[PDB]
Design an enzyme around this catalytic site. Structure first.
Site, PDB file in Angstrom:
ATOM      1  N   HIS B  47       0.866  -1.249  -0.029  1.00  0.00           N
ATOM      2  CA  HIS B  47      -0.115  -0.176  -0.058  1.00  0.00           C
ATOM      3  C   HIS B  47       0.980   1.210   0.093  1.00  0.00           C
ATOM      4  O   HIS B  47       0.823   2.277  -0.601  1.00  0.00           O
ATOM      5  CB  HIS B  47      -0.780   0.073   1.192  1.00  0.00           C
ATOM      6  CG  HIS B  47      -1.822   1.295   1.339  1.00  0.00           C
ATOM      7  ND1 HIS B  47      -1.893   2.107   2.465  1.00  0.00           N
ATOM      8  CD2 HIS B  47      -2.539   1.899   0.445  1.00  0.00           C
ATOM      9  CE1 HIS B  47      -2.536   3.283   2.357  1.00  0.00           C
ATOM     10  NE2 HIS B  47      -3.150   3.050   1.134  1.00  0.00           N
ATOM     11  N   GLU B  50       1.923   2.044  -3.289  1.00  0.00           N
ATOM     12  CA  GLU B  50       0.877   2.429  -4.265  1.00  0.00           C
ATOM     13  C   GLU B  50       0.924   4.031  -4.126  1.00  0.00           C
ATOM     14  O   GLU B  50       0.976   4.790  -5.153  1.00  0.00           O
ATOM     15  CB  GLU B  50      -0.445   2.212  -3.505  1.00  0.00           C
ATOM     16  CG  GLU B  50      -1.702   2.124  -4.420  1.00  0.00           C
ATOM     17  CD  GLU B  50      -2.856   2.452  -3.547  1.00  0.00           C
ATOM     18  OE1 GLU B  50      -3.374   1.287  -3.049  1.00  0.00           O
ATOM     19  OE2 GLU B  50      -3.589   3.513  -3.434  1.00  0.00           O
ATOM     20  N   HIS B  51       0.891   4.543  -2.844  1.00  0.00           N
ATOM     21  CA  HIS B  51       0.989   6.020  -2.449  1.00  0.00           C
ATOM     22  C   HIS B  51       2.329   6.908  -3.296  1.00  0.00           C
ATOM     23  O   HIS B  51       2.123   7.692  -3.837  1.00  0.00           O
ATOM     24  CB  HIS B  51       1.025   6.314  -1.164  1.00  0.00           C
ATOM     25  CG  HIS B  51      -0.297   6.083  -0.647  1.00  0.00           C
ATOM     26  ND1 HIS B  51      -0.807   7.032   0.247  1.00  0.00           N
ATOM     27  CD2 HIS B  51      -1.378   5.103  -0.547  1.00  0.00           C
ATOM     28  CE1 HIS B  51      -2.185   6.696   0.697  1.00  0.00           C
ATOM     29  NE2 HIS B  51      -2.285   5.413   0.130  1.00  0.00           N
ATOM     30  N   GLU B 120       4.774  10.875   3.756  1.00  0.00           N
ATOM     31  CA  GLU B 120       3.595   9.958   3.429  1.00  0.00           C
ATOM     32  C   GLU B 120       3.392   9.081   4.781  1.00  0.00           C
ATOM     33  O   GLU B 120       2.086   8.896   4.822  1.00  0.00           O
ATOM     34  CB  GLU B 120       4.005   8.748   2.136  1.00  0.00           C
ATOM     35  CG  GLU B 120       2.906   8.509   1.310  1.00  0.00           C
ATOM     36  CD  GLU B 120       2.126   9.453   0.818  1.00  0.00           C
ATOM     37  OE1 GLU B 120       2.667  10.665   0.315  1.00  0.00           O
ATOM     38  OE2 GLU B 120       0.959   9.517   0.768  1.00  0.00           O
ATOM     39  N   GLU B 127      -5.348   8.113   6.850  1.00  0.00           N
ATOM     40  CA  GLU B 127      -6.084   7.102   6.264  1.00  0.00           C
ATOM     41  C   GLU B 127      -6.558   5.755   7.116  1.00  0.00           C
ATOM     42  O   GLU B 127      -7.749   5.437   7.095  1.00  0.00           O
ATOM     43  CB  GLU B 127      -5.277   6.280   5.126  1.00  0.00           C
ATOM     44  CG  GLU B 127      -6.139   5.713   3.732  1.00  0.00           C
ATOM     45  CD  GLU B 127      -5.138   5.412   2.696  1.00  0.00           C
ATOM     46  OE1 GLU B 127      -4.098   5.975   2.463  1.00  0.00           O
ATOM     47  OE2 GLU B 127      -5.688   4.441   2.170  1.00  0.00           O
TER      48      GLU B 127
HETATM   49 ZN   LIG Z   1      -3.993   4.698   0.598  1.00  0.00          ZN
END
Ligand SMILES: [Zn+2]
Lengths: 457, 439
Positions: B47, B50-51, B120, B127
């Site tokens: 994940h 992904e970011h 991040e 999130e």
């Molecule tokens: Zn995310």
């Protein structure tokens, strides 16, 4: 027209029949009626919505329960919806089921029973729906915008039915509305992925002997007036922030107007959205409203350009939501953006801006059209409106040929109050807002201060 | 007519479906990876990648990717599931190649700047806190944890906060190195797409991708089959207004012969909501019971989740923490499953379920995007794409008997795991459930 595999013809009773595309994994079909809230006047207010909520209930030849069950067995992918200028029955189904679905549609369109019980149910339920609708700003503001833009007539006749008028919607008025608008000559049957020949067979079989009631013609042209209105601040909930809202617009263009693509480009070039904007690249973060507003002021939680385009008129403008504290600045912030599209010699629209806006417009139109249901609805409405379906190639070309000056010319025309539609509208702005009225200041004065709008006929 | 397939020398599969009369398309790169490729310390990496994929590559800075996609009207997106990593693009047909280029650039030549990697960490935490407010998500993440105890499938996609704070650029590059193999990925396209040209571009922009040293065909057994562990996790939280319960039994995988039968049975039980009803003209006995004498719950939802080598099938229930005795609604659900096992179901409800399923699986394959989604996921997790017509056939042939058989095999003398969040005092035990169910 050509690559579309678009074919159009009429039955003896005037019902137009439109088909397009080639065979595929499944099909789509719908019946389109030129009706909507703009035709209700004061006497049939709320009839359009109740009829659409009544879609697919019992009919002369099909009991309610059977109708429901057969529609489930067909996949359950159908719906009836209506708006200001449309009333449509649509569905997507497997190829072998087109005829059966067309039959059910024509039943509910031609022989609905509308029993006391079915009507009472939809009415009870409509009251609850109206109560809920009035709590959603995304639905209310646009409603106030239209009402004020046309002073409550035609395109401004309430789309949301006044709660107190629901109980007096009788079968008599529903029949009066049906006898005025549900006529073959006021209807279009469209199909995607069905051969034209087969479509003509099925249509004539189920709608061919349908006859007009030859009702009095009651279709008035929309007369834009402009205007102001303000409703009290929304109730403050829990952790949710308090926001004021304002929408400022001017009369826009008819969907088939020659400068419509230019105008849509302007809308895309302004873009905008919510200060959050979730999604990867391509969402439109390089649009002016993001750049000059969202990124600059955060007391602004939302700023977007809107373009309501109808058959004979439209409303173009900008929407803004902000913290009560910033309210005093709203009007000017919006006025500046509108001004900067044509009257600011140092912020002229650039080749890059226009080129990007152009491509994004082509993109969203073509991508939306990947869906059969969308190809269907677009085809039905186009034929319903001018009896022809503009070919894709043409649409793309007209957009690709746009040049900055085109976009600048249209911007000036709109924000200057210089649009001349059939209804011969005023050049007065439409300003609608939610919050304390005082908090917005002298609205007309700021707009005049920016050369926006028009004061002399 | 159908889906064209080609394999690249490095193992990468190219799957495509041309859509006549279109001038746009969708292209996506699907990788057998996701969170199931991580380990306890690794957990959350896929994940995180992904970011960072949109943060910059050795060829394009962040704002360079953004501005490039927006000028031509394309769209760039990505997501991570427990099974895969997927990046995809939507653009005019003219830009398909530029699309493939950017996708490859982002997946394999990402900068992974250390500054970015730190900024991040906070975004991921935010999130994470948001998912904590989605009780259905919380319940299902916990369900996966106890059902797939100490296994890959049992870990969440975001990963523990602990890990979100400790993941290093080394972890990231290691995950990339270990998982990004040609034989483990599918480039899927649909819309105005030329299969031949797309294969060339694939080779051009994705050819540099390493082959595994022990290549296995896309649909072959990863290794030891996940094992379904029976268990229960009661998460007491008396502040919650609603209580959330998920009951599951081992389900079906993507390639199971009985896959569609499992979905058909799910549709036969269906869903229900105290306010809205069933979304059906005629309610099952369960829905009726649920709505009677004050209501037994706020809603229930049948679910069936599939993976390449495993699956979960069951019921998600939402009750009023103060008003409902969970036990009463669970009784009704088990009674409904037993009704099916006992064969007491009409031809009508079977036909209704098959119609619902066909529609859900087929009428939804509408845009190039949904179609690419189906092509990519099917091929990357299965090695093949059953066509819309093949799927129609697989559902159309289902019989009342297939269903009764399937329920008797899967819902009789089989282990069940359960998770409950909220006012746990009224929630029955897992052995209670098995007793009533098998009874
Ligand atoms: Zn995310």
């Amino acid at each position: 027209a050509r690559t579309d595999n678009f074919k159009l013809s009429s039955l003896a009773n005037g019902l137009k029949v439109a088909t397009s595309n080639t065979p595929g994994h499944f099909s789509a079909l719908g019946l389109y009626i030129d009706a909507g809230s703009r035709f209700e006047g004061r006497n049939l207010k709320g009839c359009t919505h109740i009829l659409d909520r009544l879609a697919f209930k019992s009919t002369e030849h099909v009991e309610g329960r059977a109708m429901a069950e057969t529609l489930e067995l067909l996949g359950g992918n159908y719906q009836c919806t209506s708006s200001r200028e449309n009333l449509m029955y649509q569905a997507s189904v497997f190829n072998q089921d087109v005829g059966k679905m067309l039959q059910l549609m024509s039943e509910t369109v031609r022989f609905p029973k509308i029993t006391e019980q079915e009507l009472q149910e939809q009415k009870l339920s409509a009251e609850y729906e109206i109560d809920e609708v009035w709590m959603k700003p995304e639905l209310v503001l646009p409603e106030l915008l239209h009402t004020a833009a046309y002073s409550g007539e035609t395109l401004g006749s309430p789309l949301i039915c006044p709660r107190g008028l629901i109980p007096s919607i009788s079968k008599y008025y529903l029949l009066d509305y049906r006898n005025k608008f549900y006529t073959p000559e006021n209807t279009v049957a469209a199909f995607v992925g069905v051969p034209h020949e087969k479509a003509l067979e099925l249509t004539g079989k189920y709608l061919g002997d349908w006859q007009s009631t030859h009702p009095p013609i009651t279709k008035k042209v929309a007369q834009y007036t402009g205007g102001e209105s303000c409703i009290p601040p929304a109730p403050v909930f829990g952790n949710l922030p308090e926001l004021f809202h304002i929408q400022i617009g001017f009369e826009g263009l008819p969907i088939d107007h020659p400068d419509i693509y230019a105008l849509a480009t302007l809308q895309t070039l302004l873009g905008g959205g919510g200060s959050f904007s979730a999604g990867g690249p391509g969402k439109g973060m390089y649009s002016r409203l993001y750049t000059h507003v969202l990124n600059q002021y955060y007391f602004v939680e939302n700023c977007v350009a809107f373009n309501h385009s109808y058959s004979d008129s439209g409303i173009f403008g900008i929407s803004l939501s902000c913290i009560p504290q910033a309210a005093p600045q709203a009007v000017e912030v919006i006025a500046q953006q509108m001004y900067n599209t044509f009257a600011n010699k140092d912020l002229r629209l650039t080749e890059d801006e226009v080129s990007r806006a152009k491509n994004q417009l082509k993109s969203s139109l073509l991508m939306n059209l990947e869906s059969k249901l969308v190809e269907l609805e677009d085809m039905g409405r186009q034929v319903l409106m001018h009896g022809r379906k503009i070919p894709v190639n043409e649409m793309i070309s007209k957009i690709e040929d746009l040049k900055p000056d085109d976009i600048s010319r249209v911007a000036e025309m709109i924000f200057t109050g210089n649009v001349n539609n059939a209804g011969n509208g005023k050049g007065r702005a439409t300003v609608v807002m939610q919050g304390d009225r005082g908090s917005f200041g002298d609205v007309e004065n700021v707009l005049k201060a920016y050369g926006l709008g028009n004061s002399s006929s | 007519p159908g889906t064209r397939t080609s394999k690249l020398p490095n193992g990468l599969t190219i799957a495509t479906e041309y859509i006549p009369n279109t001038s746009s398309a969708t292209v996506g790169i699907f990788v057998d990876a996701g969170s199931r490729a991580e380990n306890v310390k690794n957990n959350g990496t896929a994940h995180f990648l992904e970011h960072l994929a949109f943060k910059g590559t050795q060829n394009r800075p962040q704002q360079g990717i953004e501005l490039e996609i927006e000028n031509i009207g394309s769209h760039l997106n990505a997501y991570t599931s427990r099974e895969n990593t997927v990046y995809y693009a939507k653009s005019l047909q003219e830009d398909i190649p530029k699309a493939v280029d950017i996708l490859s650039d982002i997946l394999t030549k990402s900068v992974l700047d250390n500054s970015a990697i730190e900024r991040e960490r906070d975004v991921i935490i935010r999130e994470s806190e948001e998912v904590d407010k989605m009780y259905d998500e919380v319940v299902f993440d916990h369900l996966h944890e106890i059902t797939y105890k100490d296994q890959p499938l049992g870990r969440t996609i975001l990963g523990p906060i602990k890990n979100i704070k400790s993941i290093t650029r080394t972890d990231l590059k290691d995950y990339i190195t270990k998982n990004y193999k040609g034989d483990r990925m599918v480039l899927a396209g649909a819309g105005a797409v030329d299969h031949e040209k797309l294969v060339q571009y694939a080779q051009k922009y994705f050819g540099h991708v390493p082959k595994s040293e022990s290549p296995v065909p896309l649909g072959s057994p990863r290794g030891p089959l996940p094992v379904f562990c029976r268990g229960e996790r009661f998460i007491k939280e008396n502040t919650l207004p609603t209580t959330h319960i998920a009951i599951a039994l081992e389900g079906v995988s993507w390639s199971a012969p009985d896959y569609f039968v499992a979905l058909a049975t799910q549709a036969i039980v269906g869903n229900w909501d105290r306010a809205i009803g069933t979304g059906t003209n005629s309610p099952s006995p369960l829905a009726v019971a649920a709505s009677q004498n004050g209501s037994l719950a706020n809603s229930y939802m049948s679910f069936s989740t599939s993976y390449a080598d495993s699956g979960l099938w069951g019921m998600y229930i939402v009750t009023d923490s103060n008003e409902h005795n969970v036990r009463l609604i669970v009784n009704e659900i088990l009674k409904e499953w037993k009704r099916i096992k006992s064969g007491k179901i009409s031809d009508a409800e079977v036909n209704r379920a098959k119609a619902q399923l066909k529609a859900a699986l087929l009428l939804s394959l509408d845009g190039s995007t949904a179609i690419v989604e189906d092509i990519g996921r099917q091929v990357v997790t299965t090695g093949k794409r059953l066509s819309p017509e093949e799927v129609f056939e697989q559902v159309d042939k289902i019989t009342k008997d297939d269903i009764i058989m399937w329920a008797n095999y899967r819902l009789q003398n089989k282990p069940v795991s359960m998770v409950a969040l909220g006012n746990t005092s009224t929630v029955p035990n897992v052995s209670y459930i098995e007793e009533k169910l098998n009874q």
